[PDB]
mmCIF file with all atom_site columns, C-alpha atoms in Angstrom:
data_model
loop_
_atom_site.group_PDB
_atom_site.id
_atom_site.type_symbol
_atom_site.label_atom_id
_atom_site.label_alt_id
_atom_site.label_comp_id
_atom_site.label_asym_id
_atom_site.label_entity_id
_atom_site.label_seq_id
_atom_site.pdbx_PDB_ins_code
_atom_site.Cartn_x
_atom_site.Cartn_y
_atom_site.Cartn_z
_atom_site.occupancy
_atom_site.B_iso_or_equiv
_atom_site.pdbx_formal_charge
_atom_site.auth_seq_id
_atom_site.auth_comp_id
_atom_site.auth_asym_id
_atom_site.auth_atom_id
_atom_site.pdbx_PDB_model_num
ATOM 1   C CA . UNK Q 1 1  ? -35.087 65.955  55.549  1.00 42.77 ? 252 UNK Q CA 1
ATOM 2   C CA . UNK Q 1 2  ? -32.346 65.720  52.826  1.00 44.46 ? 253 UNK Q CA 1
ATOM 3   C CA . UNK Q 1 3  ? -29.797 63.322  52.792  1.00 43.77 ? 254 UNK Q CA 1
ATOM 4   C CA . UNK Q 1 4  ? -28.616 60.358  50.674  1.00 41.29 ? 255 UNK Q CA 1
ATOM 5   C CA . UNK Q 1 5  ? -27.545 56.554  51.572  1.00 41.31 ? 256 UNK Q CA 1
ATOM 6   C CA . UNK Q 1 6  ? -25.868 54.528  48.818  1.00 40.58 ? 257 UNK Q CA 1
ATOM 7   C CA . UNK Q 1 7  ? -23.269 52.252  48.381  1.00 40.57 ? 258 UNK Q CA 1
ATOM 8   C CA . UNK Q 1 8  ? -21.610 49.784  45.513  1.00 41.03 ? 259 UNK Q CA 1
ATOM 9   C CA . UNK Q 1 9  ? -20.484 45.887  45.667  1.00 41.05 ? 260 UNK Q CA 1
ATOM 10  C CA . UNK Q 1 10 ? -17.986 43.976  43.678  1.00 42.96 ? 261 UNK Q CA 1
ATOM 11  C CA . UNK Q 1 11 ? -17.100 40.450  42.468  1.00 42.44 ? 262 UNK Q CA 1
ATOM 12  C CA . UNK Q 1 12 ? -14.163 38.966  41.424  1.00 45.28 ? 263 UNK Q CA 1
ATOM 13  C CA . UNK Q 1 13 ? -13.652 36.357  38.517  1.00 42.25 ? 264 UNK Q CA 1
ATOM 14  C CA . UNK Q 1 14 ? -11.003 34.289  37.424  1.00 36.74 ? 265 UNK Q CA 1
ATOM 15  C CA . UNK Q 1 15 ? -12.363 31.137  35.869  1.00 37.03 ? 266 UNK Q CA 1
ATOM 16  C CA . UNK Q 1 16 ? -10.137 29.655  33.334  1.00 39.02 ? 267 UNK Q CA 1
ATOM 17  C CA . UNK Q 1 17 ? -11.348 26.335  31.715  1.00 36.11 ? 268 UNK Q CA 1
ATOM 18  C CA . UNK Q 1 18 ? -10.343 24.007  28.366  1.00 34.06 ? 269 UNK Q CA 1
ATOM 19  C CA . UNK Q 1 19 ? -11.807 20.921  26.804  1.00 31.54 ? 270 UNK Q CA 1
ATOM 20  C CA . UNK Q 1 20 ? -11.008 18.242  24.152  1.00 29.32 ? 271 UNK Q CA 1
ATOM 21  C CA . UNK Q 1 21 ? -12.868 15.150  23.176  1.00 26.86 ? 272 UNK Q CA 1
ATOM 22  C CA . UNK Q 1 22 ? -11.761 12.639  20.176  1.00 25.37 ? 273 UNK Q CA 1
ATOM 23  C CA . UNK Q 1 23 ? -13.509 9.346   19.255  1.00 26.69 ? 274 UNK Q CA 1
ATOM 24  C CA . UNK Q 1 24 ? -12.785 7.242   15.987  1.00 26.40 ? 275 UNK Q CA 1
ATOM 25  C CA . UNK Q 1 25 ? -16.314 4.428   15.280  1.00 29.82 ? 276 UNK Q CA 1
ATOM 26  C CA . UNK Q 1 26 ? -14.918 1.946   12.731  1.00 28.05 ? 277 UNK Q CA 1
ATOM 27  C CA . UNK Q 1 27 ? -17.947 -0.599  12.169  1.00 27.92 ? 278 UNK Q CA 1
ATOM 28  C CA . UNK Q 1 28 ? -17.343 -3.202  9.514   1.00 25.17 ? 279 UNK Q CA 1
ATOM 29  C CA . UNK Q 1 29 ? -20.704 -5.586  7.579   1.00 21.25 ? 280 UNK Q CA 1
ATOM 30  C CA . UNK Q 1 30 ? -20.504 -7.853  4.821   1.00 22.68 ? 281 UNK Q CA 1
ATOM 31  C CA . UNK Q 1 31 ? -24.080 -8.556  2.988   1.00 24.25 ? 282 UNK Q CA 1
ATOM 32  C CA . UNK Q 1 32 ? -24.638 -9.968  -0.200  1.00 24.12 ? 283 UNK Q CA 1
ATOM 33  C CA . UNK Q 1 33 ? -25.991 -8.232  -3.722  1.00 24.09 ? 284 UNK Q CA 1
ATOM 34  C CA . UNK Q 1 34 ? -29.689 -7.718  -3.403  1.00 25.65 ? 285 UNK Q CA 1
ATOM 35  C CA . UNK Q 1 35 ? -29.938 -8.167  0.641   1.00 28.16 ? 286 UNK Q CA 1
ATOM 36  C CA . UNK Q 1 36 ? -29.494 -6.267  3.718   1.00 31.37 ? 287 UNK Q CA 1
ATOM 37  C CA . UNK Q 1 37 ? -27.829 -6.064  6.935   1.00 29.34 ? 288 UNK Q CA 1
ATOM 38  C CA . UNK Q 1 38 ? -28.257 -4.478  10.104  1.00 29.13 ? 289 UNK Q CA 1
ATOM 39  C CA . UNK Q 1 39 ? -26.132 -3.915  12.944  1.00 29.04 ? 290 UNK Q CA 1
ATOM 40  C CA . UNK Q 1 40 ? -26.279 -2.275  16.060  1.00 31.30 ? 291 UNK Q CA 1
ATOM 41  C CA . UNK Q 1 41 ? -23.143 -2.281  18.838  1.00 30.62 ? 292 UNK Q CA 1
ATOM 42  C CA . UNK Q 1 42 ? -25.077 0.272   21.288  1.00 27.38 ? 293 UNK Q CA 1
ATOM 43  C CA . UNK Q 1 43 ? -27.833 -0.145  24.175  1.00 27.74 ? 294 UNK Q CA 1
ATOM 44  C CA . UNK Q 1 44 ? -31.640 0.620   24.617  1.00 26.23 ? 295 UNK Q CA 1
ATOM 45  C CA . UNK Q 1 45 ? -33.804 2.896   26.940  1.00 28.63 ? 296 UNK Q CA 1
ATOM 46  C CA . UNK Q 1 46 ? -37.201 2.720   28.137  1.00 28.16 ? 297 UNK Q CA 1
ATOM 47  C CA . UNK Q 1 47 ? -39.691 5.567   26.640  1.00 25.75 ? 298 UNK Q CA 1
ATOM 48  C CA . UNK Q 1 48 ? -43.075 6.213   27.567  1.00 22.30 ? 299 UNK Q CA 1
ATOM 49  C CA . UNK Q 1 49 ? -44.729 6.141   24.461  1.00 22.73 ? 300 UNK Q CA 1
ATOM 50  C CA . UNK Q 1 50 ? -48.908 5.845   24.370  1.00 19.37 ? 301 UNK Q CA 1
ATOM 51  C CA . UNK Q 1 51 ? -51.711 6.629   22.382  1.00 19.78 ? 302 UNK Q CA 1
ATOM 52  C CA . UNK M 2 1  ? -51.840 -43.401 -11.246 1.00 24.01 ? 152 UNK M CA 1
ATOM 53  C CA . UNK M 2 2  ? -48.354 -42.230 -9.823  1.00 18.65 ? 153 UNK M CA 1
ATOM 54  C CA . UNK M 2 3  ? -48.275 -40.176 -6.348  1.00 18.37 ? 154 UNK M CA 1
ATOM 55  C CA . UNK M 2 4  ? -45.972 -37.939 -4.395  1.00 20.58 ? 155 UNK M CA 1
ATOM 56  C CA . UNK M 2 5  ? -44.394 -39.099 -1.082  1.00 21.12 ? 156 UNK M CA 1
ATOM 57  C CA . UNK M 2 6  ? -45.622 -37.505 1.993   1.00 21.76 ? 157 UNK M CA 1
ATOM 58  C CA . UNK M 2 7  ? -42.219 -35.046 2.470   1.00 24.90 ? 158 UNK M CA 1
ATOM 59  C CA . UNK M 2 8  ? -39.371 -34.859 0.895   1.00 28.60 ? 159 UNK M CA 1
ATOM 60  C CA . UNK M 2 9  ? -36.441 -35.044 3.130   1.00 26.00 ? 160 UNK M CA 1
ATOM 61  C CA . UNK M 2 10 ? -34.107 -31.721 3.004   1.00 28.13 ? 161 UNK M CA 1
ATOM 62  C CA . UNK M 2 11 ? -30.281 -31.442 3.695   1.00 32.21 ? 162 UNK M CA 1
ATOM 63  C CA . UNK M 2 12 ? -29.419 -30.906 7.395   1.00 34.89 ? 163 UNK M CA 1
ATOM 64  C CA . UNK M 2 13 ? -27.097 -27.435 8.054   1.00 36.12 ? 164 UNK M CA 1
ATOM 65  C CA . UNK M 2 14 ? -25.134 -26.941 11.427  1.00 36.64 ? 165 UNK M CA 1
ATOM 66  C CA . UNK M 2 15 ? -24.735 -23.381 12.207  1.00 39.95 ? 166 UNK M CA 1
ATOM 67  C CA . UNK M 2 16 ? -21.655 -21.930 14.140  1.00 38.20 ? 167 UNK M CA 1
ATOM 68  C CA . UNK M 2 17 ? -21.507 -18.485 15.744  1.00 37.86 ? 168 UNK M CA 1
ATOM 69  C CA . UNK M 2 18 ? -19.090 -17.261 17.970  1.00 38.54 ? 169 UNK M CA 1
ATOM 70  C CA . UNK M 2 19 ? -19.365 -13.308 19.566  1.00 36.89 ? 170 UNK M CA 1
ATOM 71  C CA . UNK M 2 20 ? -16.204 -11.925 21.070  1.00 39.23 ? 171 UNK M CA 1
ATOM 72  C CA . UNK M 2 21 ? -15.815 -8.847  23.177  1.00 38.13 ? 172 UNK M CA 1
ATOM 73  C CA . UNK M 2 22 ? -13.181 -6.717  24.906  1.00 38.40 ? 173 UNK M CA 1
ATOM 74  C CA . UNK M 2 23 ? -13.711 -3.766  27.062  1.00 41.89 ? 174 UNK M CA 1
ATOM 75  C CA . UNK M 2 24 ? -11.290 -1.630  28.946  1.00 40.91 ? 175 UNK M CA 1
ATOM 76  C CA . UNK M 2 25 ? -11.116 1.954   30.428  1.00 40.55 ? 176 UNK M CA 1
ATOM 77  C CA . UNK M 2 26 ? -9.293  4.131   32.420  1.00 40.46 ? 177 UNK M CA 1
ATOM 78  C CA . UNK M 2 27 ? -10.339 7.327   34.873  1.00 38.48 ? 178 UNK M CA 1
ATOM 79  C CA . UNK M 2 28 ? -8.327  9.802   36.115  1.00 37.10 ? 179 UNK M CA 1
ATOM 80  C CA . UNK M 2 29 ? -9.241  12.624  38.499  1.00 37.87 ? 180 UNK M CA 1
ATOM 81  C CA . UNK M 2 30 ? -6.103  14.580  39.933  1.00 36.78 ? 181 UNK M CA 1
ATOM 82  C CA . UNK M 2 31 ? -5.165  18.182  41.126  1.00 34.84 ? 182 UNK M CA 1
ATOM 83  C CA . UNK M 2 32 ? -6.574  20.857  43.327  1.00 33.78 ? 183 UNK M CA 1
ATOM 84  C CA . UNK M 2 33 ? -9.635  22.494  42.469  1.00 35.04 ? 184 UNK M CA 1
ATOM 85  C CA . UNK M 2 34 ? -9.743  26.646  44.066  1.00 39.00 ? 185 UNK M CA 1
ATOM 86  C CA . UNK M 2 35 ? -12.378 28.808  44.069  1.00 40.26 ? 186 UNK M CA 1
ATOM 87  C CA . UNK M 2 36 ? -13.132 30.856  40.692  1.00 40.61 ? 187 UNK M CA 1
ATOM 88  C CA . UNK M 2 37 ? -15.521 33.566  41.792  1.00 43.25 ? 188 UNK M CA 1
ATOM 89  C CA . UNK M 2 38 ? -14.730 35.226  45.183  1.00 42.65 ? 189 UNK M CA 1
ATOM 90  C CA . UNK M 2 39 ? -16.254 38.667  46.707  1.00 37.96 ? 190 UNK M CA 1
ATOM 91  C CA . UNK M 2 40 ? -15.201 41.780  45.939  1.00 37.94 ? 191 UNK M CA 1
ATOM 92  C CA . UNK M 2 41 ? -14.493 45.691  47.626  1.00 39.63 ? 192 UNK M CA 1
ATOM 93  C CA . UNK M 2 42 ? -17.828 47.527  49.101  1.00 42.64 ? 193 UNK M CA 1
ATOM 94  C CA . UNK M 2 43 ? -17.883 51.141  49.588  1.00 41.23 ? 194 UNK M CA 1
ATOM 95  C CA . UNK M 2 44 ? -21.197 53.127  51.125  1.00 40.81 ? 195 UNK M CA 1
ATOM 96  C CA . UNK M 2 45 ? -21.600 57.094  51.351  1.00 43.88 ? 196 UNK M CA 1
ATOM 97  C CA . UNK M 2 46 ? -24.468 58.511  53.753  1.00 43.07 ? 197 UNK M CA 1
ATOM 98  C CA . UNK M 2 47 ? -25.129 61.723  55.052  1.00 41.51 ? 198 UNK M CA 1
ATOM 99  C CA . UNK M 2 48 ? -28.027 64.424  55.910  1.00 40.92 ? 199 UNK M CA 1
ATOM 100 C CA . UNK M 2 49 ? -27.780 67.709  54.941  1.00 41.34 ? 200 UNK M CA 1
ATOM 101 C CA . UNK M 2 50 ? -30.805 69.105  56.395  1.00 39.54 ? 201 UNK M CA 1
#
């Protein structure tokens, strides 16, 4: 017995894609000589965090 | 034989404190979306000589 069986498959592509993205953070403080200030203009998540 | 009164009374301070905020946004989603990846030509060959 001699003999073959083969074959080939394809696929086509045409994806064509584009991004942009801009963001401008202008946070302003005022503190006085010797002290400190802290801000925070954000929100917070729970973590699991144990010992 | 002098002594100290129990307190001294401080000066009184009002504190004011006013928080202002202003959100807006916008969303836009239009157009047609097609397929990017689509199936291609097949071609098979089989025979037996013997």
């Amino acid at each position: 017995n001699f003999g073959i069986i083969t074959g080939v498959l394809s696929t086509i592509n045409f994806a064509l894609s584009n991004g942009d993205a801009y963001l401008i953070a202008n946070p302003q403080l005022s503190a006085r000589s010797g002290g400190r200030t802290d801000f925070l203009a954000g929100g917070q998540v729970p973590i699991l965090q144990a010992l | 034989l002098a002594t100290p009164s129990p307190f001294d009374m401080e000066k009184m301070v009002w504190l004011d404190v006013n928080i202002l905020e202003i959100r807006k946004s916008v969303l836009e989603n239009f157009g047609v979306d097609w397929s990017k990846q689509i199936p291609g030509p097949f071609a098979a060959f089989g025979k037996d000589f013997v």
